[PDB]
Amino acid sequence: DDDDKLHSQANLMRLKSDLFNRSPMYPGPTKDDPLTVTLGFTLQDIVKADSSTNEVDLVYYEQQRWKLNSLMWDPNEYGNITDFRTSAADIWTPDITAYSSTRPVQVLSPQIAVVTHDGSVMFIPAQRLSFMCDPTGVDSEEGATCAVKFGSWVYSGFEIDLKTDTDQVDLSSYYASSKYEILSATQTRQVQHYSCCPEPYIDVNLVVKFRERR
Amino acid sequence: DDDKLHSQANLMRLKSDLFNRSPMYPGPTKDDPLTVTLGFTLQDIVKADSSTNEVDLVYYEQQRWKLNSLMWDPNEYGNITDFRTSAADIWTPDITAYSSTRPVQVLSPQIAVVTHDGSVMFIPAQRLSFMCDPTGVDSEEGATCAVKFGSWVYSGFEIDLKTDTDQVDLSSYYASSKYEILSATQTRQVQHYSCCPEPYIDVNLVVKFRERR
Amino acid sequence: DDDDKLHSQANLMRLKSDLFNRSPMYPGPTKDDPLTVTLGFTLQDIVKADSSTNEVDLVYYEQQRWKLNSLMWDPNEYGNITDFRTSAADIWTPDITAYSSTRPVQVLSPQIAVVTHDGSVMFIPAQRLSFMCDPTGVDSEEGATCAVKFGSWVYSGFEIDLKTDTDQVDLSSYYASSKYEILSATQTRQVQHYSCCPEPYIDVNLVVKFRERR
Amino acid sequence: DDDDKLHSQANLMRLKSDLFNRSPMYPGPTKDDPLTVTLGFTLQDIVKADSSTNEVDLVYYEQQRWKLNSLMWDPNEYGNITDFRTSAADIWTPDITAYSSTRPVQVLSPQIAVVTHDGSVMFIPAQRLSFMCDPTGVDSEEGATCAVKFGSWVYSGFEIDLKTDTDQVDLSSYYASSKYEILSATQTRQVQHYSCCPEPYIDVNLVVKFRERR
Amino acid sequence: KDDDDKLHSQANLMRLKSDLFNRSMYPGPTKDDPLTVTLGFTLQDIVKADSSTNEVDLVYYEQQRWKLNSLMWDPNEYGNITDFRTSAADIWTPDITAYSSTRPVQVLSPQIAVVTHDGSVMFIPAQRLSFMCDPTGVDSEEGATCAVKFGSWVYSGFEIDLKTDTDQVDLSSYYASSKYEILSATQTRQVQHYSCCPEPYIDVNLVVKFRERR
Ligand SMILES: Clc1ccc([C@H]2C[C@@H]3CC[C@H]2N3)cn1
Ligand SMILES: Clc1ccc([C@H]2C[C@@H]3CC[C@H]2N3)cn1
Ligand SMILES: Clc1ccc([C@H]2C[C@@H]3CC[C@H]2N3)cn1
Ligand SMILES: Clc1ccc([C@H]2C[C@@H]3CC[C@H]2N3)cn1
Ligand SMILES: Clc1ccc([C@H]2C[C@@H]3CC[C@H]2N3)cn1
């Protein structure tokens, strides 16, 4: 049964080939082919809050899900391969960007996604973000409140739509011994209009109330 | 399903037919001058280091230009009016801050939008450290600083700049920033440099600011 | 005279060619072809502990080992070459990622591995890591305790399995005059489940007890 | 004129393709075929003088100019194209290096150079340099005084020679409101010798005298 | 006259280089076919000693020297070309790495090496290194004392050997005005053994004894 191993790999190498070098590179969404990306935020730590610049440093991971008929296949032609991991470079990925960011976002996780036979893609980049947020109040019972919104930078609402599965930011993995404890963190979808462009823009707005321990 | 398949067969076609045959339109020439429109939305003045006289801004810079070479007719492609593309896939203008003091930091996806008339728009969100003496930032008057943005390699006869208005966009300036803005103006300038015979256009960003109170 | 050197080289260039550029795959692990990676940690220095952000900086090396039938050769027909060094780019390498990390990991070693005729691969990246770690207690007899877990970020337990050779993290090479002395450092295998995914995920958890030297 | 821009381009695209793609790119100067770069500095600002490490940070741009015969063409064979801009990684560029630098040089500007028909090339990289410089006295009448030498790292005086246009640094762009006032800034050709190598090495010595701006 | 002579000299060096790389190739040292690098340090400056992390930052240049068969030519087929400069990435270079480093080494110089007709290569990368080093006592008569060993990361004592030209580090270029005076600096050949692997590994041990100025 090392022969069995060899087939499962002949097949995966074939599925991947037939997908990525047959009808090459899906060109991103268009008005005519809109795409909805599901966003979820696991907040792990509020690393730093610089009260003299009003920047705050978060480490989270952001879970992204979309679906593409172009990534669809029947397992029964690929030997019951239901899914597979691939390089995030190998496929179109959504350009989800933090709007109040103040340094380039730092990737903490491997650039790899998982594609399923229904053409559904899931991708979870863990990131360190520095964003505009005024920590005044972080040492009072009330704490301080901060927001940062995540959305497509280039695609409108007619091209990319966003939706969350839940309002509650995942705090189950929040670092126990963090300098700051979480009081609430909500992921909410929003529409904004910008002075650049006629169309609306979907973002998911992350709102975090927090304070120092003791 | 079916209709989706076509509008992507088309997009893959347009993209292909454009970027191949002239892989690289090779940039402007005196023969083929190009004007790029600049706008600045100021988001935040993060930091003002009075000990080094560096100031830190976070803004985004909106760039627009036009290229016959990116021109196409919607009816050739099933009414595709425009599309998103990688910023590496196309020629982009080399707009550089002149009094910058650290490499500019890109905060946005490197992607642009191309329209059927061959007009391109691109908006890099940037964090900039530039030369600026914040003395006065703690007085009613505040402190004034300037930093000029312009092509680094292309002259006025190759790239020209113009702004659609002189007021820097402050509608999205951070409400709880350490510094409040008093005025921010984007104005076109001509300078000459000791390096080169021809004139060089820059858009000069002028910002008066003071500490929030 | 010197001709012998020339053969050993023709033959290494041949083995490498026949392996890499006459492919037959390696697409990474799948359920049908699971892979077990051996992890070992040599802890070199606790560089910094920042009490105000609850971040700690470690310098270690991470010894990885796996096996691949696809990298297997009969040395007889390659001038009796038993192994060779290759660029880590030139092969599939496991995506072993620190979960509590707070800045991207810093590579301190050459991006090179050694492959043996049995298809066994060993790769030891030296790294600087910053992770969520609360140093409170670092200046008491007891010291402070911190954990960081290392695992595949994208491959589950059905694709990648992890195993240590020993529970003892290697302190042989730990800096003598480091700001912090180690009181124990244990590498222990674990299974977690995550909100993202149906299947379990293996990680090796590094647990470090430390305090300020005298 | 639609076509009068298609021709201009096809020519430039072909011109470039003739010089690099079709031509074997020039292997740097030799003792047998030497080369003179002409260096110039525009000093823009002394950003930081750190008297706890004796590092000073300058921001300046360095005008570089050399002539290559491999880079000559006939504007008659390319629709009268007297010159063009191209990326610095398409051509050979001199390795002019700061000798007393303490942090790898930071590029403030795009990596693009201008080539003219007679083969002359100009390159103006803008940079930030941390170099070894005791700033004691920077708060007195007479100020402090600092040197940093630029010159080829690898090529000696028989491969690369240096010229300046003038031994006055370009203070025309010095930041009027800089922490530091410039008192003098001179650039001078020099010959050194080092242990490594038997020939002499040519540098241009930048010497700044400055004080904290009253 | 000279226009032709410099077109010949170039065509030969263009040819010679394309003879050595674009044909004839060298896959690093083997036990079969070993190699000795000769290391030498010119220490230039101790920039920073951070007593809060026990990190020291040196700025030095490292002279590397090895000899390769695959790199020999006869100047009479290549018009008396005794040597040439070429990019480090066109030839094999040793992976001499700092063992006690805390931050990835920073390259202060261009990556170009010199190859002579007898196959010998010289490569002098200039570097900024942060390494593990308790600087206590640095403000006393007797100062502090620190070691950092450089040596191959992957290659054993049977693939790469090391030798130094002298046990004295070059302080003839030490920054006369640095925050730290050097009291001694010696480079010493050493053999280590590690858990990971069976054979000896050779390093050169750099040992610096230093104090703050006055
Ligand atoms: Cl494609 C993808 C992204 C993220 C993940 C997650 C599952 C485990 C836990 C976090 C991360 N690793 C799994 N797969
Ligand atoms: Cl190419 C492009 C088009 C539009 C934009 C803008 C839309 C969202 C909000 C500001 C910025 N991102 C940015 N880039
Ligand atoms: Cl290749 C090149 C040509 C010209 C220039 C110059 C244009 C602006 C002003 C001085 C410098 N930057 C810079 N680089
Ligand atoms: Cl390949 C090579 C040869 C020589 C050098 C040296 C010559 C000058 C002085 C030190 C360094 N720069 C550096 N690299
Ligand atoms: Cl492929 C490989 C082999 C061996 C090693 C190790 C042996 C010496 C000590 C640490 C590192 N260098 C690291 N990587």
Q: What is chain D written as a DSSP string? A: --HHHHHHHHHHHHHHIIIIITS-------SSS-EEEEEEEEEEEEEEEETTTTEEEEEEEEEEEEEEEEEE--TTTTTT--EEEEEGGGS----EEETTEEEEEEE-S--EEEEETEEEEEE--EEEEEEE---TTTTSSS-EEEEEEEEESS--TTTEEEEES-SB-B-TTS-TT-SEEEEEEEEEEEEE--TT-SS-EEEEEEEEEEEE--
The maximal CA–CA distance of chain E, rounded, in angstroms, is: 66
CB E105 within 8 A of CB E129: yes
Q: How far apart are CA C58 and CA D81, in angstroms?
A: 57
- D124–B195: do the CB atoms touch at under 8 Å? yes
Structure tokens at A205: 């707005």
Method by which this entry was solved: X-ray
Quote the DSSP letter at residue B136.
Answer: T
Partners of residue B1 in chain A, C-beta under 8 Å: 69
Quote the DSSP letter at residue E73.
Answer: -
- Give residues with Cβ within 8 angstroms of B91, minimum separation 6: B24, B25, B26, B27, B67
CB A169 within 8 A of CB A58: no
To the nearest 10°, report the CA torsion of E196, E199, E202, E205.
50
Q: How far apart are CA A95 and CA A105, in angstroms?
A: 12
Cβ–ligand 2 contact at B206 (below 6 Å)? no
- Give residues with Cβ within 8 angstroms of E2, minimum separation 6: none
Task: Nearest chain D residue to E18 by CA: give it.
Answer: D24
Return the SS3 of A88. helix
Task: Nearest chain C residue to E131 by CA: give it.
Answer: C47
Partners of residue B51 in chain D, C-beta under 8 Å: 179
For chain D, which chains pass the contact test of at least 3 CB pairs under 8 Å? B, E
Residue A62 annotated in ligand binding: no
Look at residues D187, D106, D202, D87 and name the one whose alpha carbon lies nearest to residue D154: D202
- Nearest ligand to the CA atom of D65: 3
H or E stretch covering A130: strand A126-132
CB C170 within 8 A of CB C41: yes
CA distance, residue A96 to nearest chain B CA (Å):
8
Phi, psi dihedrals of residue D126, rounded to the nearest 5°: -90, 140
Structure tokens at A47: 């690393």
Q: How far apart are CA E192 and CA A18, in angstroms?
A: 51
Q: How far is CA D37 from the centre of its chain?
A: 9
Residue B82 annotated in ligand binding: yes
* Torsion region of D54: left, alpha or beta (phi above 0 gives left; psi -120 to 50 gives alpha): left
Return the SS3 of E11. helix
Structure tokens at B112: 């642009």
- Nearest ligand to the CA atom of D201: 4
Instruction: Strands of A7-54 (E only): list them.
Output: 35-50
CA-nearest residue for atom 14, ligand 1, is C154
Q: How far apart are CA D162 and CA D101, in angstroms?
A: 20
Between the CA of B62 and the centroid of ligand 2 the distance, in Å, is 8
- E175–D132: do the CB atoms touch at under 8 Å? yes
What value, to the nearest 5°, has the Cα angle with vertex D67 and ends D63 and D68?
135
- C175–E33: do the CB atoms touch at under 8 Å? no
CA-nearest residue for atom 12, ligand 2, is A153
H or E stretch covering C173: none
CB B92 within 8 A of CB B34: no
To the nearest 10°, report the CA torsion of E10, E11, E16, E20.
110
Look at residues D128, D117, D122 and name the one whose alpha carbon lies nearest to residue D37: D122
CA-nearest residue for atom 12, ligand 5, is E153
Q: Which residues of C79-102 are buried (b: 16+ CB within 10 A; e: fewer)?
A: bebebbbbebeebbbbbbbbbbbb
CA-nearest residue for atom 5, ligand 4, is D154
Structural domain including D123 reads 1-214
End-to-end CA distance of chain A: 59
- Structure's resolution in angstroms: 3.4
Q: How far apart are CA D44 and CA D62, in angstroms?
A: 11
CB C68 within 8 A of CB C119: yes
Total structural domains within chain C: 1
Return the SS3 of E72. strand
For chain A, which chains pass the contact test of at least 3 CB pairs under 8 Å? B, C
Residues of E with CB under 8 A from a CB of D: 3, 5-7, 9-10, 13-14, 17-18, 42, 44-45, 47-48, 59, 63, 79, 81, 84-86, 106-110, 112-114, 122, 124, 126, 128, 170, 172, 175, 177-179
Partners of residue A112 in chain C, C-beta under 8 Å: 95, 153-154
Question: CATH no. for residue C91?
Answer: 2.70.170.10
Structure tokens at D90: 């398409």
- Give residues with Cβ within 8 angstroms of D178, minimum separation 6: B53, B131, B133, D45, D46, D213
Residues of C with CB under 8 A from a CB of A: 25-28, 30, 32-33, 52-55, 69, 95, 97, 100-104, 132-134, 136, 153-155, 159, 195-196
Structure tokens at E131: 């390494």
Phi, psi dihedrals of residue B189, rounded to the nearest 5°: -135, 155
Gyration radius from chain A CA atoms: 20
How crowded is residue C38: how many other Cβ atoms within 10 Å of its Cβ?
17
